[PDB]
Tab-separated table of C-alpha atoms in Angstrom:
chain	number	residue	atom	x	y	z
A	2	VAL	CA	3.905	-26.387	8.186
A	3	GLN	CA	2.396	-27.926	5.642
A	4	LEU	CA	3.601	-29.099	1.721
A	5	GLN	CA	1.390	-30.142	-0.949
A	6	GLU	CA	2.976	-30.762	-4.523
A	7	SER	CA	1.736	-30.694	-7.888
A	8	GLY	CA	2.528	-30.496	-11.164
A	9	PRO	CA	1.284	-33.548	-14.734
A	10	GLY	CA	1.212	-36.786	-13.758
A	11	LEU	CA	2.451	-38.247	-16.975
A	12	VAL	CA	5.485	-35.987	-18.983
A	13	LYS	CA	7.271	-37.767	-22.271
A	14	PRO	CA	10.329	-38.657	-22.192
A	15	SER	CA	13.634	-36.334	-23.082
A	16	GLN	CA	10.667	-33.594	-22.091
A	17	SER	CA	10.570	-31.389	-18.991
A	18	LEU	CA	8.661	-31.922	-15.710
A	19	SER	CA	8.106	-29.048	-13.440
A	20	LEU	CA	6.395	-29.110	-10.018
A	21	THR	CA	5.041	-26.630	-7.788
A	22	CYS	CA	5.288	-27.277	-4.294
A	23	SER	CA	3.034	-24.866	-2.162
A	24	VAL	CA	4.042	-24.283	1.365
A	25	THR	CA	2.142	-22.849	3.114
A	26	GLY	CA	1.727	-22.333	7.450
A	27	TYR	CA	5.225	-21.107	6.779
A	28	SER	CA	7.521	-18.702	5.370
A	29	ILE	CA	9.741	-19.843	2.330
A	30	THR	CA	12.025	-16.962	2.609
A	31	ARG	CA	11.674	-17.313	7.043
A	32	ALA	CA	13.729	-20.286	7.516
A	33	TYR	CA	15.048	-23.802	6.537
A	34	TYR	CA	15.959	-25.883	3.933
A	35	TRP	CA	13.087	-26.958	1.198
A	36	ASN	CA	14.115	-29.882	-0.503
A	37	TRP	CA	12.480	-32.194	-3.473
A	38	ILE	CA	13.855	-35.458	-2.636
A	39	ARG	CA	11.640	-38.736	-4.849
A	40	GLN	CA	10.983	-42.111	-4.105
A	41	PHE	CA	11.874	-44.785	-6.870
A	42	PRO	CA	9.557	-47.855	-7.723
A	43	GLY	CA	11.208	-50.097	-4.938
A	44	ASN	CA	11.294	-47.442	-2.533
A	45	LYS	CA	14.528	-45.728	-2.855
A	46	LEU	CA	14.803	-43.155	-1.730
A	47	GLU	CA	16.623	-39.584	-3.732
A	48	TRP	CA	17.465	-36.673	-2.302
A	49	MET	CA	17.089	-34.542	-5.632
A	50	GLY	CA	17.702	-31.096	-3.915
A	51	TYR	CA	17.561	-28.312	-2.381
A	52	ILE	CA	16.793	-24.280	-2.465
A	53	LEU	CA	17.963	-22.414	0.902
A	54	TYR	CA	15.247	-19.343	2.673
A	55	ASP	CA	17.755	-16.892	1.355
A	56	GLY	CA	17.028	-18.293	-2.711
A	57	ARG	CA	20.580	-20.128	-3.030
A	58	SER	CA	20.439	-23.693	-3.866
A	59	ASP	CA	22.458	-27.441	-4.603
A	60	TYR	CA	21.633	-30.719	-6.448
A	61	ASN	CA	22.285	-34.057	-6.020
A	62	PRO	CA	25.501	-34.711	-8.532
A	63	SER	CA	23.652	-37.544	-9.294
A	64	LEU	CA	21.137	-34.942	-11.774
A	65	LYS	CA	24.235	-33.592	-13.547
A	66	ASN	CA	23.020	-30.299	-15.013
A	67	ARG	CA	19.389	-32.067	-15.609
A	68	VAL	CA	17.653	-30.306	-12.141
A	69	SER	CA	16.457	-26.791	-11.426
A	70	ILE	CA	14.773	-25.518	-8.499
A	71	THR	CA	12.926	-22.337	-8.783
A	72	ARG	CA	10.655	-19.951	-6.472
A	73	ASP	CA	8.249	-17.416	-6.235
A	74	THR	CA	7.883	-15.642	-3.454
A	75	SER	CA	4.693	-14.414	-3.717
A	76	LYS	CA	2.982	-17.046	-4.144
A	77	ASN	CA	4.937	-18.754	-1.483
A	78	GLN	CA	5.388	-22.052	-4.307
A	79	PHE	CA	8.859	-23.389	-4.706
A	80	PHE	CA	9.221	-25.502	-8.295
A	81	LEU	CA	11.411	-28.798	-9.860
A	82	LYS	CA	12.647	-28.789	-12.590
A	83	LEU	CA	13.847	-31.233	-14.432
A	84	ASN	CA	14.785	-31.976	-18.054
A	85	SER	CA	15.598	-34.654	-20.308
A	86	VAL	CA	13.609	-37.321	-18.204
A	87	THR	CA	13.329	-41.110	-19.156
A	88	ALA	CA	11.728	-44.076	-17.382
A	89	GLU	CA	14.670	-43.994	-15.175
A	90	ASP	CA	12.460	-40.867	-13.537
A	91	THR	CA	9.511	-41.810	-13.086
A	92	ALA	CA	8.606	-41.490	-9.166
A	93	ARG	CA	6.815	-40.484	-6.613
A	94	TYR	CA	8.466	-36.676	-5.650
A	95	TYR	CA	7.934	-35.034	-2.062
A	96	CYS	CA	9.144	-32.241	-0.865
A	97	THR	CA	9.997	-30.987	1.649
A	98	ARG	CA	11.194	-28.241	4.454
A	99	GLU	CA	14.292	-28.917	7.437
A	100	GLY	CA	16.241	-27.503	9.989
A	101	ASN	CA	16.592	-26.943	13.965
A	102	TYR	CA	15.665	-30.925	13.775
A	103	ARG	CA	12.817	-31.126	12.347
A	104	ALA	CA	11.019	-32.081	9.284
A	105	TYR	CA	7.691	-32.187	7.308
A	106	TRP	CA	6.894	-34.017	3.938
A	107	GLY	CA	4.599	-33.448	1.235
A	108	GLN	CA	2.242	-36.847	0.706
A	109	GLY	CA	3.806	-36.875	-2.814
A	110	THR	CA	2.664	-36.741	-6.536
A	111	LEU	CA	3.126	-39.131	-8.460
A	112	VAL	CA	5.209	-38.785	-12.508
A	113	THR	CA	5.136	-41.682	-14.749
A	114	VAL	CA	7.742	-40.541	-17.619
A	115	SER	CA	6.236	-42.297	-20.909
A	116	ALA	CA	5.490	-41.835	-24.279
A	117	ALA	CA	2.089	-44.077	-24.438
A	118	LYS	CA	-1.118	-42.359	-24.476
A	119	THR	CA	-3.296	-41.314	-21.367
A	120	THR	CA	-6.710	-44.382	-22.033
A	121	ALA	CA	-9.353	-44.574	-19.368
A	122	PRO	CA	-10.135	-48.377	-18.257
A	123	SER	CA	-13.007	-50.337	-17.815
A	124	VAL	CA	-14.790	-51.345	-15.273
A	125	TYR	CA	-16.032	-54.919	-14.096
A	126	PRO	CA	-18.257	-55.748	-11.796
A	127	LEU	CA	-17.598	-59.606	-10.174
A	128	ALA	CA	-20.679	-61.094	-8.882
A	129	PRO	CA	-20.340	-64.568	-7.363
A	130	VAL	CA	-20.668	-67.435	-9.631
A	131	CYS	CA	-24.431	-68.998	-10.499
A	136	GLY	CA	-22.168	-69.718	2.700
A	137	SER	CA	-22.050	-66.532	6.212
A	138	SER	CA	-21.121	-64.378	3.471
A	139	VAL	CA	-20.805	-63.595	0.200
A	140	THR	CA	-17.388	-61.387	-1.583
A	141	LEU	CA	-18.315	-59.329	-4.129
A	142	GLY	CA	-15.239	-57.669	-6.569
A	143	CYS	CA	-14.468	-54.822	-9.101
A	144	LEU	CA	-12.078	-54.929	-11.950
A	145	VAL	CA	-10.646	-51.888	-13.457
A	146	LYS	CA	-8.277	-52.701	-16.560
A	147	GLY	CA	-6.575	-51.064	-19.077
A	148	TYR	CA	-6.012	-47.441	-18.191
A	149	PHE	CA	-2.448	-45.280	-18.049
A	150	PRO	CA	-1.278	-44.140	-16.135
A	151	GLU	CA	-1.406	-44.426	-13.021
A	152	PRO	CA	-3.745	-43.789	-11.147
A	153	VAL	CA	-7.301	-45.102	-9.680
A	154	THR	CA	-9.212	-44.474	-6.302
A	155	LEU	CA	-11.975	-47.101	-5.978
A	156	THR	CA	-14.157	-46.753	-3.262
A	157	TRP	CA	-17.233	-49.232	-2.921
A	158	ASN	CA	-20.844	-47.378	-1.902
A	159	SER	CA	-18.974	-44.577	-1.979
A	160	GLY	CA	-16.958	-44.879	0.606
A	161	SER	CA	-19.230	-45.869	3.140
A	162	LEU	CA	-17.847	-49.331	2.576
A	163	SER	CA	-14.722	-49.196	3.786
A	164	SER	CA	-14.600	-52.769	5.436
A	165	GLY	CA	-14.041	-56.380	4.124
A	166	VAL	CA	-12.616	-54.616	1.424
A	167	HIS	CA	-8.922	-55.183	-0.719
A	168	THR	CA	-8.289	-53.102	-2.822
A	169	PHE	CA	-5.024	-55.005	-4.779
A	170	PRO	CA	-2.253	-52.819	-6.107
A	171	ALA	CA	-1.802	-52.121	-10.053
A	172	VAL	CA	0.041	-54.396	-12.203
A	173	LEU	CA	1.070	-52.864	-15.541
A	174	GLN	CA	0.387	-55.835	-18.894
A	175	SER	CA	0.953	-54.933	-21.740
A	176	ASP	CA	1.072	-51.253	-21.870
A	177	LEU	CA	-2.109	-50.702	-19.276
A	178	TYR	CA	-2.607	-50.895	-15.552
A	179	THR	CA	-5.476	-53.265	-13.960
A	180	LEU	CA	-6.089	-53.167	-11.022
A	181	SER	CA	-9.010	-55.369	-8.631
A	182	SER	CA	-10.610	-54.497	-5.007
A	183	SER	CA	-13.194	-57.140	-3.646
A	184	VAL	CA	-15.502	-56.941	-1.181
A	185	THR	CA	-17.210	-59.109	1.565
A	186	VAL	CA	-20.843	-58.710	3.628
A	187	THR	CA	-23.437	-60.982	5.310
A	188	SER	CA	-24.403	-63.435	2.587
A	189	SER	CA	-27.956	-61.940	3.489
A	190	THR	CA	-27.391	-58.576	2.661
A	191	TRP	CA	-26.801	-58.620	-0.767
A	192	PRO	CA	-28.227	-58.530	-3.175
A	193	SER	CA	-31.529	-56.690	-1.592
A	194	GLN	CA	-28.668	-53.499	-0.543
A	195	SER	CA	-26.680	-51.788	-3.017
A	196	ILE	CA	-23.302	-52.197	-3.779
A	197	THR	CA	-21.587	-50.248	-6.614
A	198	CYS	CA	-17.883	-49.722	-6.927
A	199	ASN	CA	-17.053	-46.201	-7.823
A	200	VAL	CA	-13.476	-45.500	-10.151
A	201	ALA	CA	-11.826	-43.215	-9.857
A	202	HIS	CA	-9.102	-42.049	-12.977
A	203	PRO	CA	-8.023	-38.035	-13.063
A	204	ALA	CA	-5.670	-37.895	-16.674
A	205	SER	CA	-8.642	-39.613	-18.075
A	206	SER	CA	-11.905	-37.323	-16.292
A	207	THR	CA	-12.628	-40.482	-15.813
A	208	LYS	CA	-15.246	-41.036	-13.147
A	209	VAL	CA	-17.428	-44.440	-13.362
A	210	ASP	CA	-20.286	-46.256	-10.890
A	211	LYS	CA	-20.964	-49.731	-11.257
A	212	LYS	CA	-23.731	-51.381	-9.921
A	213	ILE	CA	-22.527	-55.167	-9.156
A	214	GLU	CA	-25.445	-56.623	-9.981
A	215	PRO	CA	-26.382	-61.073	-9.805
A	216	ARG	CA	-25.799	-63.504	-12.812
A	217	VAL	CA	-28.145	-65.111	-14.602
A	218	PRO	CA	-29.442	-68.511	-14.220
B	1	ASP	CA	28.583	-39.891	-1.701
B	2	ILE	CA	28.439	-41.223	1.464
B	3	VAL	CA	26.474	-43.940	1.791
B	4	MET	CA	24.388	-46.071	4.142
B	5	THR	CA	23.662	-49.800	4.611
B	6	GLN	CA	21.458	-51.213	6.636
B	7	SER	CA	21.337	-54.748	7.240
B	8	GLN	CA	18.298	-56.818	5.355
B	9	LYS	CA	15.758	-55.743	3.292
B	10	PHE	CA	12.727	-58.118	4.945
B	11	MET	CA	12.745	-58.535	8.822
B	12	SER	CA	10.028	-61.201	10.307
B	13	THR	CA	9.279	-60.141	14.113
B	14	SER	CA	6.475	-61.131	16.373
B	15	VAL	CA	3.943	-58.723	18.268
B	16	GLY	CA	6.697	-58.248	22.214
B	17	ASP	CA	10.110	-58.848	20.240
B	18	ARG	CA	12.414	-56.264	20.393
B	19	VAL	CA	13.332	-55.872	16.888
B	20	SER	CA	16.781	-53.817	16.162
B	21	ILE	CA	17.814	-52.219	12.357
B	22	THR	CA	21.522	-52.008	12.353
B	23	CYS	CA	22.919	-48.966	9.283
B	24	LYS	CA	26.256	-48.456	9.185
B	25	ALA	CA	27.859	-44.932	6.781
B	26	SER	CA	31.090	-45.348	4.457
B	27	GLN	CA	32.555	-42.036	6.900
B	28	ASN	CA	32.443	-40.618	9.912
B	29	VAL	CA	29.097	-38.860	10.566
B	30	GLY	CA	29.407	-38.017	13.844
B	31	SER	CA	25.757	-38.276	15.538
B	32	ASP	CA	23.910	-36.717	12.245
B	33	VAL	CA	21.617	-39.447	11.378
B	34	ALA	CA	17.655	-40.113	11.015
B	35	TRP	CA	15.554	-42.267	11.308
B	36	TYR	CA	12.486	-42.293	9.436
B	37	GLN	CA	9.034	-44.728	9.101
B	38	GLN	CA	7.557	-44.627	5.791
B	39	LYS	CA	3.338	-47.388	6.062
B	40	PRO	CA	2.068	-47.883	3.035
B	41	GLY	CA	0.247	-44.679	1.129
B	42	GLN	CA	2.129	-42.348	3.653
B	43	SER	CA	5.174	-40.285	3.317
B	44	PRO	CA	7.564	-40.661	5.739
B	45	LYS	CA	7.941	-39.820	8.975
B	46	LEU	CA	11.245	-38.506	10.840
B	47	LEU	CA	11.757	-40.829	14.002
B	48	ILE	CA	14.371	-40.400	15.576
B	49	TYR	CA	16.951	-37.431	15.294
B	50	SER	CA	20.557	-36.951	16.069
B	51	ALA	CA	20.888	-40.223	16.373
B	52	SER	CA	19.350	-41.053	20.030
B	53	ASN	CA	16.200	-38.467	20.018
B	54	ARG	CA	12.408	-39.285	19.670
B	55	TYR	CA	10.200	-36.879	17.120
B	56	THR	CA	8.036	-35.656	18.849
B	57	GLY	CA	4.604	-37.918	19.611
B	58	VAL	CA	6.932	-41.000	19.094
B	59	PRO	CA	6.227	-44.051	21.323
B	60	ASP	CA	8.932	-44.342	24.089
B	61	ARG	CA	9.119	-48.084	22.486
B	62	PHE	CA	11.371	-46.556	19.606
B	63	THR	CA	14.943	-46.585	20.656
B	64	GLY	CA	18.082	-45.504	18.747
B	65	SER	CA	21.444	-44.675	19.482
B	66	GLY	CA	25.209	-45.133	18.244
B	67	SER	CA	28.008	-42.741	16.689
B	68	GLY	CA	30.646	-43.087	14.337
B	69	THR	CA	30.240	-45.506	11.269
B	70	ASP	CA	27.172	-47.753	13.304
B	71	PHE	CA	23.428	-47.039	14.589
B	72	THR	CA	21.225	-48.638	15.379
B	73	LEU	CA	17.414	-47.843	15.675
B	74	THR	CA	15.313	-50.437	18.599
B	75	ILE	CA	11.740	-51.156	18.593
B	76	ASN	CA	10.899	-52.344	22.545
B	77	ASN	CA	7.933	-55.134	22.165
B	78	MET	CA	6.764	-54.296	19.008
B	79	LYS	CA	3.402	-53.971	18.284
B	80	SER	CA	1.181	-54.120	15.153
B	81	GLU	CA	1.101	-50.520	14.958
B	82	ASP	CA	4.475	-51.255	13.684
B	83	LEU	CA	4.039	-52.393	10.488
B	84	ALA	CA	6.122	-50.677	8.751
B	85	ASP	CA	9.270	-49.877	6.386
B	86	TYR	CA	12.194	-48.123	7.957
B	87	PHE	CA	14.750	-46.489	6.629
B	88	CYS	CA	18.770	-44.466	7.719
B	89	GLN	CA	19.246	-41.148	6.982
B	90	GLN	CA	22.664	-38.996	7.165
B	91	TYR	CA	22.480	-35.094	6.852
B	92	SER	CA	26.356	-35.137	7.912
B	93	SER	CA	26.335	-33.666	4.621
B	94	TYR	CA	25.189	-33.157	1.651
B	95	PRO	CA	23.684	-35.089	-0.782
B	96	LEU	CA	20.954	-36.434	1.371
B	97	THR	CA	22.099	-40.395	1.459
B	98	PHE	CA	19.153	-42.650	2.686
B	99	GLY	CA	20.051	-46.560	3.637
B	100	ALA	CA	17.402	-48.564	1.400
B	101	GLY	CA	14.907	-49.646	4.034
B	102	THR	CA	13.842	-52.301	5.711
B	103	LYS	CA	10.423	-53.912	5.683
B	104	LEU	CA	8.665	-55.539	8.621
B	105	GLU	CA	6.955	-57.843	8.879
B	106	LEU	CA	4.897	-59.291	11.093
B	107	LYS	CA	4.554	-63.627	12.125
B	108	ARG	CA	0.929	-64.562	13.465
B	109	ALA	CA	0.012	-68.691	13.135
B	110	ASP	CA	-0.288	-69.890	9.047
B	111	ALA	CA	-4.422	-68.737	8.562
B	112	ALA	CA	-5.998	-70.484	4.726
B	113	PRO	CA	-7.329	-68.530	2.246
B	114	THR	CA	-10.939	-67.958	1.715
B	115	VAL	CA	-11.214	-68.345	-2.093
B	116	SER	CA	-13.655	-66.980	-4.591
B	117	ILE	CA	-13.983	-67.396	-7.938
B	118	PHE	CA	-15.544	-65.007	-10.907
B	119	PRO	CA	-16.188	-65.840	-14.705
B	120	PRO	CA	-16.316	-62.944	-16.893
B	121	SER	CA	-19.298	-60.119	-16.600
B	122	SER	CA	-21.548	-60.254	-19.297
B	123	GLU	CA	-20.162	-56.158	-20.213
B	124	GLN	CA	-16.476	-57.228	-20.699
B	125	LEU	CA	-17.375	-60.243	-22.607
B	126	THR	CA	-20.029	-57.689	-24.555
B	127	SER	CA	-17.055	-55.715	-25.123
B	128	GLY	CA	-15.584	-59.020	-26.802
B	129	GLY	CA	-12.960	-59.907	-23.712
B	130	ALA	CA	-13.038	-61.813	-20.933
B	131	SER	CA	-10.559	-62.978	-18.118
B	132	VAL	CA	-11.624	-64.795	-15.112
B	133	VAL	CA	-10.978	-63.566	-11.319
B	134	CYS	CA	-9.663	-65.764	-8.439
B	135	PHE	CA	-9.774	-63.783	-4.440
B	136	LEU	CA	-7.652	-65.264	-2.243
B	137	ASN	CA	-8.502	-63.205	1.098
B	138	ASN	CA	-7.510	-63.092	4.885
B	139	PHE	CA	-4.159	-65.916	5.201
B	140	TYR	CA	-0.802	-66.672	5.922
B	141	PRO	CA	2.242	-66.774	4.407
B	142	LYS	CA	2.543	-65.119	2.170
B	143	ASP	CA	4.221	-67.737	-0.209
B	144	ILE	CA	1.063	-69.013	-2.609
B	145	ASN	CA	0.786	-70.681	-5.583
B	146	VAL	CA	-2.297	-70.052	-7.590
B	147	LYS	CA	-2.519	-72.100	-11.082
B	148	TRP	CA	-4.927	-71.894	-13.385
B	149	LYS	CA	-6.315	-74.528	-15.216
B	150	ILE	CA	-9.226	-74.300	-18.533
B	151	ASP	CA	-10.346	-78.098	-19.641
B	152	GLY	CA	-8.173	-79.299	-16.997
B	153	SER	CA	-4.993	-77.498	-18.629
B	154	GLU	CA	-2.332	-75.263	-16.410
B	155	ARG	CA	-2.423	-71.819	-18.321
B	156	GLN	CA	0.392	-69.333	-17.299
B	157	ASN	CA	0.298	-66.817	-19.778
B	158	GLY	CA	-2.312	-63.867	-19.416
B	159	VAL	CA	-2.241	-63.782	-15.499
B	160	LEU	CA	-1.946	-61.439	-13.078
B	161	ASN	CA	-1.086	-61.309	-9.525
B	162	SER	CA	-1.087	-58.647	-7.060
B	163	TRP	CA	-0.867	-59.103	-3.372
B	164	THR	CA	-1.562	-56.950	-0.926
B	165	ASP	CA	0.572	-55.355	1.610
B	166	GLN	CA	0.450	-57.659	5.284
B	167	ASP	CA	-2.545	-55.888	7.088
B	168	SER	CA	-1.566	-54.499	10.999
B	169	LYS	CA	-5.045	-55.314	11.921
B	170	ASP	CA	-4.664	-59.679	11.114
B	171	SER	CA	-1.002	-59.793	9.749
B	172	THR	CA	-3.069	-61.516	7.607
B	173	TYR	CA	-2.364	-61.242	3.466
B	174	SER	CA	-4.670	-60.787	0.042
B	175	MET	CA	-4.307	-62.120	-3.594
B	176	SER	CA	-5.868	-61.219	-6.583
B	177	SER	CA	-5.202	-63.158	-9.738
B	178	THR	CA	-6.718	-62.193	-12.937
B	179	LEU	CA	-6.342	-64.964	-15.999
B	180	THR	CA	-6.799	-62.853	-19.083
B	181	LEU	CA	-7.693	-64.644	-21.837
B	182	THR	CA	-9.744	-63.969	-26.271
B	183	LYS	CA	-13.436	-64.462	-26.080
B	184	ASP	CA	-12.734	-67.372	-28.298
B	185	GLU	CA	-10.956	-68.889	-26.068
B	186	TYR	CA	-12.958	-68.152	-23.501
B	187	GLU	CA	-15.671	-69.765	-25.420
B	188	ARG	CA	-13.797	-72.425	-27.088
B	189	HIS	CA	-13.280	-74.326	-23.832
B	190	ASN	CA	-15.764	-75.280	-20.634
B	191	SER	CA	-14.542	-75.365	-17.212
B	192	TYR	CA	-12.765	-72.336	-15.460
B	193	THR	CA	-10.265	-73.106	-11.965
B	194	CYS	CA	-8.203	-71.715	-9.983
B	195	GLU	CA	-6.242	-73.452	-7.314
B	196	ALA	CA	-4.688	-72.343	-4.544
B	197	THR	CA	-1.538	-73.960	-2.457
B	198	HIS	CA	-0.473	-73.210	0.687
B	199	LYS	CA	1.851	-74.939	3.399
B	200	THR	CA	-1.898	-74.929	5.488
B	201	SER	CA	-2.385	-78.111	3.502
B	202	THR	CA	-1.412	-80.570	1.814
B	203	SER	CA	-4.241	-80.355	-0.546
B	204	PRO	CA	-5.127	-77.066	-2.583
B	205	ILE	CA	-8.358	-75.374	-2.411
B	206	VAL	CA	-9.834	-75.501	-5.267
B	207	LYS	CA	-12.507	-72.995	-6.822
B	208	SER	CA	-13.971	-74.006	-10.261
B	209	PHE	CA	-16.864	-73.679	-12.324
B	210	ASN	CA	-19.029	-75.048	-15.303
B	211	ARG	CA	-19.676	-72.013	-18.448
B	212	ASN	CA	-22.605	-74.088	-18.820
B	213	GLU	CA	-22.800	-72.370	-15.043
C	1	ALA	CA	24.814	-30.806	10.582
C	2	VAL	CA	22.926	-29.843	7.477
C	3	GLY	CA	19.531	-30.930	6.525
C	4	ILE	CA	17.234	-31.399	10.067
C	5	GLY	CA	20.726	-30.964	11.830
C	6	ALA	CA	20.911	-27.648	10.577
C	7	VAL	CA	19.867	-24.657	13.230
C	8	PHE	CA	18.076	-21.913	12.096
């Protein structure tokens, strides 16, 4: 079985969060428990509820009457609706299939509950100050919400990379990444950081240029 | 609300050592307990089911046992690929409940960081901002002090520090430190220094530049 | 006997 979560990654407080789980490789009316489970910042896991193959559903009492799980058997999808969300509902949302001593999980999808507006990042190249190796960097500043993806030379540069988790400063996120190459590689060979921010439909490719003496 | 309490949140280990994680259930759950492994950037993966049974593909070095209110996951001969967060789960009754999770760390020989400093990019300065970045790469242990100095005087306001997860390849950490200041303050001062104080030396690693450059 | 432990 394969499970894939989808839906908006930013929801305004007090409004409703809806996510879809698309299932392939198995029928959601055939067997097992089909669950929503979320993971908070700090990694705590909470089981939200299930819909059974027969369409019965049940929920974690911690969610009050806020939660409803629903399904489309023609599309083989099941759905989460969580009403009246607050910041404490920010989490990565997973769907799972459980039974017969098997557990399959989706990759999850992040949902941020905030009133702040989607903001695209600025991408700054970090060239060395004007050794056997040279370290370059990319600074991604002032975006919202998570996530961004960052690669070097379209992914072909992977070894020697460190990408640092984003942190929220003011209302906005900042992320950075470094890459280390042999000293004769750059600048003669091009090194570009590729930054994608799906929420703002941003795709930027920043070449790291040497500084001027 | 069956509460699953895990022993300790963080455990340090060495490659080749046995490590045991424990989970104590508030009520009697019988054998109905699963252990999950979660690596960074991945969904949790079932490891042990029915308290003693390795799931498909799980290596023989993983064992689990226990009944009643007491359960243990055992790593025999820890490997670097076992760096992860582990969570116990009870499926005796709904709601499903997880332990708080235990993070494993690997011990390794102390390693001093390789430190690189980056002045603001011309692009950031042209747009009216200024950020100074210091990368501290491939060090151990994790606790490192970075201090920023502007014309010799310490600045802790506007500093954002982000660590990677421990790298299973070499058991090191890296971290980025970003000092953000107004461009007009940036242009009022000459020297910019990041100083790394780490248990690997009594003297800090200093990287500096002067705006004159 | 629920979740992964339920038989189907």
